[PDB]
Design a protein around this ligand. Sequence first.
Ligand SMILES: [Cu+2]
Lengths: 37, 37, 35, 37
Amino acid sequence: GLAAIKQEHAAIKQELAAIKQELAAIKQELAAIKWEG
Amino acid sequence: GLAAIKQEHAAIKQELAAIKQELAAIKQELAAIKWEG
Amino acid sequence: GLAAIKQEHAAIKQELAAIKQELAAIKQELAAIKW
Amino acid sequence: GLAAIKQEHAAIKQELAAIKQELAAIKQELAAIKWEG
Ligand SMILES: [Cu+2]
């Protein structure tokens, strides 16, 4: 069970990484938008 | 015990998946307001 | 140990709730930009 | 095992706090774009 919990935490870590990649993509769009106001 | 921890991890993972989907939708909406597509 | 894990998981859940509140606020600003 | 689990929970909490702060920054940036046109 200690290894099982560590694996579940690793899965959560991967989803946090995917969220960080979406945040970066949003910031990229905001930078483009900022030129156009 | 161990089973209840595993359930809480499943709920956390599911919520992170939903947050990720919402961020992807926000990114698409932002991209669409730019002058060039 | 089990109570500590439960408390840590409750704190994580509360932060997820706060994140959903910020998402709603982002959506409000974007809707204002497009209104 | 208990110390390792606590450390990973602290990492998850810290990642979520950082995600929340990035979202607050995105919200504030969008508000600036809203005001300036
Ligand atoms: Cu956990």
